[PDB]
Design a protein around this ligand. Structure first.
Ligand SMILES: CN(C(=O)[C@H](Cc1cccnc1)NC(=O)Cn1nc(C(F)(F)F)c2c1CCCC2)c1ccccc1
Ligand SMILES: CN(C(=O)[C@H](Cc1cccnc1)NC(=O)Cn1nc(C(F)(F)F)c2c1CCCC2)c1ccccc1
Ligand SMILES: CN(C(=O)[C@H](Cc1cccnc1)NC(=O)Cn1nc(C(F)(F)F)c2c1CCCC2)c1ccccc1
Ligand SMILES: CN(C(=O)[C@H](Cc1cccnc1)NC(=O)Cn1nc(C(F)(F)F)c2c1CCCC2)c1ccccc1
Ligand SMILES: CN(C(=O)[C@H](Cc1cccnc1)NC(=O)Cn1nc(C(F)(F)F)c2c1CCCC2)c1ccccc1
Ligand SMILES: CN(C(=O)[C@H](Cc1cccnc1)NC(=O)Cn1nc(C(F)(F)F)c2c1CCCC2)c1ccccc1
Lengths: 208, 207, 202, 211, 211, 218
C-alpha cells in the first residue's frame, strides 16, 4: 500500500500480515455475503494493483466466482482501452489490472503530479465484479421472503433486508409494499391499519 | 480516521483491521445491549464519514436494525438541511455529512479546515441517536414490569432493574425500585426511610 | 488519554481497542475480585474523564454495582464543591465529565501547573470500586478458621484473600488456627515471620 | 527484511514473530494449495536471502517437497553462475554468485549491501523468484486430479463442478481449450443447455443457465 | 516503565495490557514453578516501583505467598534504611531527595519521584533495587512450593535415564552437585557410568545408558 | 534486543511479551524438532546475551536437554578464552574491556557492558557469538530427541511414496543438524517398497526427486 510517513511523504509499504489474514478469514467465514465487499475495500485502503492481485490470489476456493471476477476485470480493461486509446506514458487496461505493469510503474502513476490512481481504478473494477458475485450467490429471491406464522416480525425483517442487500448490490416504496404484502395475515392487518408512510421503527413496534 | 502526526498536522490514516474486526465482533456478541454504543463511539474515534459508513457496512446480520439506523440518518440529514438553508467555503449538506455525496478529500477538507467543520463528529451523533432507538427497541422488557421474584436475591433484581432502565434511557426510579421488590425486602426498604442509598438498600436485603 | 509522545510532547490519543477489550474481559472473568482495581488503575493510565466514562460504560452487566459506583462519584463530586467554594477551576461535575468538554479536560490536565482532573476522577472511581469489592466479598475475616484436616498454607491463602477484599490481623491468624498448629505457633514466640509460621505447621 | 526508516534510508529489520507464525500456519493448514505461493511472496516482502531461508526452515512438515525446492534452487543457482560469471573498488561490492543469492556462501552484511547499493542488486527478489519456481512445481505435483478428469457428477451443481475445474486448472498452470473441456465434461443435462447458448458465452451466463 | 524515545531521552510509558495479561497468565498456568522468576524479570523490564506493585497486585490467589513476599520486601527495605540513612537538610538544586526503603518499594514515593530517580544523571535505579527485593522473595516462594528435595529423587529401575535426569535438574532449579547424579542412579546405569568414570559430560552419560 | 531507532540509532529495547510467549509455546508444541532451531534464531534476532539467557530460562521441562546445552556453552566459552585471552591492565578511554567466555555467556557481564560491546565501532557481537554456541548445543538436543536412524526408514507396503519421503528427509534433517549426496537418494531408493523400487529402478540412475515422486504417484 501507499501511505505517508509520520513526517509527511507518500511511501510504499509491504502489505501487513494481519491484513492478509483478515481478508482470508473474511472469505472463508462469510463466503460472498454482502458485507464482504466493504471489508475488501477497507482492507485494501491505499492498495497498489499488485496488492489487489495479492489479496485476490490468497482466496482459496470459490474459484468459479474468481474466474468470473477475472472475466469482469477483462471487460473493464477492454472498455478502458476504448475510452482511452516529454509526455508520460498513460496506463492501458492491462497496466491497471497489473498484468503488464511493474510495481515501479504503478507507484509512478499513483504518485505522479497529477496522479493516475491505478489502484483506485482497479479497485473499482474488482468491486464491480464482487457485486455481480454477491447477487448471483444470493440463495433466495426477495419475493420468496415471507413471514412464517410463528416467526417474530423482527426476524422476518432481518431476512428481508439481508436478502434485499445481496440482490441490490448494497445499492424505495416497492420494498415497503413487498415487506407488508409478505407479512403474515395478523401483522399485515396491523401494518395496513398504520396508514401509509410509516417508518420501519413504527412498523416493528406495531408488530411486537 | 484523522490522527495527529509528528509535525502537529492532522493527517489521514487508513482504518486498521483490528478496529474493523473489533466492531464486527462487538455486534456479533453483544447484539444491541446498551454497552454497544460507548464501544462504537470509542472505536470510531476520529472517524471520517467514509470510515463511519465502512463500520456500519461491515455489519452483516441485524439488517432490520441497520435499515432503521439508515432511516434515522436520513431524518437527521433532512433536519440539517432545514436548519442550514442555502473566498467563502462551501458548507456541507446532510448528504455530505452522511458521506453519500461527498468525497474523502472533501470530508478531510472540512474536518481539517480552520476553523474545522467536524462532519465526522456530526455524523457520529446521528448514528448514536439511531443506535439509542435500536437499543431501546431490543429491550426485552419495560422497566415497569421488572419485578423481584419471591426467591430472587435482591442484588440480581437490581442488576436487571438498572440494565433495563439504561436500555430505555431520579426520584421516580427509586420509588419504582422499592415498589417492585418482593414483599419481604420491600418492608425492609420502607423501614429504612427516605434518603437511603442503593448501597444501604442492598445491605438491608442481603439476607 | 494524555501520554508522552515519541518527541517528548504530551498529546491526546484515542483510547486503544486493545485497552477497551482488556477492561471488558477483566470484569467478565473476575467480576469484582480485589485484583480488578489495580487492573483498572493500570488500564486507565493517563486517561481523561471522558476515557474513564468510556471504560465504565462498556461494562455490560453488574449494573447494580455500577449504579453504586455512580452514587459514590456523586458524593465525591458534591464534596469537591464544598471543599472548593466559589483561571476557572473545575467543579465536581467537570471532573466527572458530565459538564466539561474534552477540550476543557485537556486544558486542565496540561496546564502549568496542572489540575489533574483525570487523576482526581480515577481516585473517586477507585474509592467506589473499593466499596463494591468489599460488599461483594462472601465472608468476613472473623469467620475464617482453619479446618482440622486443612493444611496451614491453604488456610492462610483464604485468610489474606478475604483480608484484601475487606480493607491485629496477626492475632486473628493464630487465634483461628486449628488447636494443633495453634499450639506450635505460640510455641515459636512473638514476632515470628509468616515463613517461620508456615514451615512449623507444614 | 529491508525496510526504510523515517530518514529515507533502507534499514534492516528482524522478521516479526507474526510473519513467522503466519507462514508456518499457512503451510500447516493449506499444505501446497495454489494460494500458498502468493501468501509466501507477500509474507516475504522485502526479505533478504537469509530471511527467505529462515521462512523455509521454519517449515517442519512436507520435507519431501522442501527437498525438491532445494533441488530447484540449486539448478537456478548454477544457471545464474552462467549468465553472470578480484579487487573490489572502494564503496562497491563483490559480484554475487548463485550460492550467494541462495544465502549458502553469503553473509547478511553482504546481502544488506547489495540490496541497499546505489546501483541496487536485489538478491532477495532473485532468490524469491527461484523459490516461487520451485513452489510452482510442488503445487503441480500435489494436485490430486488432472484437468482432463474433472467431470460434473449426475446431481452435482454446476457451481461446485466449475469450482473443482478452475481449482485444478490453477494448480497445473502454476482459453477456448479450457472452455471446450468445461462444456464437454458437464453432465449431459447441462452440456445440452450450454451447447444451445451458442459460442462466446461468459462463465456468468453459463452458470445462470445451469442453476 | 521507562523507555527511550526518539531524542535519546528516557521517558515514562504506560504499562501495556499485553504485559499485564502475560504476567497474570503465567501465574495462573505455572503457579510458582522456577521458570516464573525469569518471566517476571523479563516482563518487568524497565518497570518503575509503581509498575512492580501493579504486577504484584494483579496476582489472583496465592495470597499466603504474596504475604511472604510482602514481608521479605519489608525486611529488605529496613536493611536499606540501615545501610543508607537519609541525611536531613535542604536538597541541593537539580538533585533528588534520597530514597528510603519505602520510597524504593513505592509506598511513600510518587510516580514523578520514581521517574526522577530512574532518569537522573547519575541514575538511582529504584526500580532495579525494588526488583531485586521482589526476586529474593519469589525465590523463597519457589522453595516452599517445591515438593521434593534434590536428595529424595532416584531413578526408578524401569524409569529411563533421560526421564530421571529430567526430574533431577528440575528439582535442583527449585532448590558441584553433578557428582551426585551418578551416585543416585539405578544399579545398571551406575555401573556403565562408573566405567566411563571421570570427566564425563552429561551427553556421554546419557549415551552410555541410552538403552 | 538492540534495534535501529527510527532516527538511525542502535538502542536497547526490552524483550516483548509476544516474543517471550512465542518461544515458550514453540518448545511446548514442537519440543526439539529441527525447525525449532531456526525459530529460536529468528525470535532472538538482535538479542543481547541477557535476552538469550531469558529465553532459555523460561523453558519448562526438558531440563536434561537444557543442562546438556549449558555444558555445551561452557565448552565454547573455554575455547573462546584459549583463543582470546584478556590482556591485563587499564582499558583505554572510549574502549571496552576484552570479553571472556563468561562475559559472552552473560554470567559475569552486565547489560550495560553487553550494550557497549554490541554497539561499539567496530562492534563486538557478543549476542551473535553466544547464539552460535546455543545453536551448537541445540543441534545435539535435536539429534538426541530423534533416535530413529535414517537406515531404519523403510516405505510401508501400502504407504504412499510421498509420505515415505516425508519421513525420510525429516529424519535426515534431524541427524544432519539441517546441514546440506548420492548415498542419500540411493538409500531412499534402496528402502522403498517393492512396487515403487521397481519403478524407480526402471527410471534409470541419476533421477531427480521430482521425477521419482511423479513416477510413484500411483
Ligand atoms: C453511503 N451509505 C452507505 O454506504 C450505507 C451505510 C449504512 C448506514 C446505516 C446502516 N447500515 C449502513 N450503506 C447501506 O445503506 C447498505 N445497505 N444497502 C441496503 C439495500 F438497499 F441494498 F437494501 C441495505 C443496507 C444496510 C441495511 C439496510 C439494507 C449511506 C449512508 C447514509 C445513508 C444512506 C446511505
Ligand atoms: C457522564 N457520565 C457517564 O457517562 C456515566 C459513567 C458511569 C459511571 C458509573 C458507572 N457506570 C458508568 N454513565 C452512566 O451513567 C450510564 N448509566 N445510565 C444509567 C441509567 F440511569 F440511564 F439507567 C445507568 C448507568 C450506569 C449505572 C447504572 C444505571 C456520568 C459520570 C458520572 C456521573 C453521572 C454520569
Ligand atoms: C504499595 N504496596 C502495594 O501495593 C502491595 C504490593 C505487593 C507486595 C507483595 C505482594 N503482593 C503485593 N500490595 C499489597 O500490599 C496488597 N495487599 N493487601 C493486603 C491486605 F493486607 F490488605 F489484605 C494483602 C496484600 C498482598 C498480600 C496479602 C495481603 C506495598 C508494597 C510493599 C510493601 C507494602 C505495600
Ligand atoms: C496478474 N493477475 C493475477 O495475478 C490474478 C488476480 C486475480 C483476479 C481475479 C480473481 N482471482 C485472482 N490471478 C490469477 O489469475 C490466478 N488464476 N490463475 C488461474 C488459471 F489460469 F491458472 F486458471 C485462475 C486464477 C484465479 C481464478 C480461476 C482460474 C491478473 C489480474 C487480472 C486479470 C488477469 C490476471
Ligand atoms: C547466566 N546463565 C543463565 O542464566 C543460564 C542460561 C541457560 C543456559 C543453558 C540452558 N538453560 C539456561 N541458566 C541456568 O543455568 C539455569 N539453570 N540452573 C540449573 C540448576 F543448576 F540450578 F539446576 C539448571 C539450569 C538450566 C537447565 C539445567 C539445570 C548462564 C549462561 C551460560 C552458562 C551458565 C549460566
Ligand atoms: C542455507 N540453506 C538453508 O538453510 C536451507 C533452506 C531451505 C530451502 C528449501 C527448503 N527448506 C529449507 N535449509 C535446509 O536445507 C535444511 N534442510 N536440511 C536438510 C538435510 F539435508 F539435513 F536433511 C533438509 C532440509 C530442508 C528439507 C529437506 C531436507 C540452503 C539454501 C539453499 C540451498 C541449500 C541450503
Amino acid at each position: 500500500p501507499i501511505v505517508q510517513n509520520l513526517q509527511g511523504q507518500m511511501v510504499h509499504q509491504c502489505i501487513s500480515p494481519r491484513t492478509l489474514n483478515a481478508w482470508v478469514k473474511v472469505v472463508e467465514e462469510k463466503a460472498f455475503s454482502p458485507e464482504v465487499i466493504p471489508m475488501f475495500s477497507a482492507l485494501s485502503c491505499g492498495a497498489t494493483p499488485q496488492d489487489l492481485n495479492t489479496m485476490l490470489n490468497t482466496v482459496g476456493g470459490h474459484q468459479a466466482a474468481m474466474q468470473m471476477l477475472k472475466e469482469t476485470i477483462n471487460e473493464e480493461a477492454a472498455e478502458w482501452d476504448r475510452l482511452h486509446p516529454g509526455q508520460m506514458r498513460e496506463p492501458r487496461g492491462s497496466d491497471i489490472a497489473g498484468t503488464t505493469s511493474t510495481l515501479q510503474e504503478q507507484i509512478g502513476w499513483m504518485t505522479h503530479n497529477p496522479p493516475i490512481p491505478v489502484g483506485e481504478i482497479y479497485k473499482r473494477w474488482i468491486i464491480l465484479g464482487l457485486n455481480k458475485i454477491v447477487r448471483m450467490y444470493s440463495p433466495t429471491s426477495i419475493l420468496d421472503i415471507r413471514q412464517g406464522p410463528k416467526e417474530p416480525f423482527r426476524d422476518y425483517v432481518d431476512r428481508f433486508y439481508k436478502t434485499l442487500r445481496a440482490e441490490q448490490a448494497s445499492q424505495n416504496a416497492a420494498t415497503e409494499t413487498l415487506l407488508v404484502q409478505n407479512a403474515n395475515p395478523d401483522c399485515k392487518t396491523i401494518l395496513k391499519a398504520l396508514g401509509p408512510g410509516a417508518t420501519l421503527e413504527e412498523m416493528m413496534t406495531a408488530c411486537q
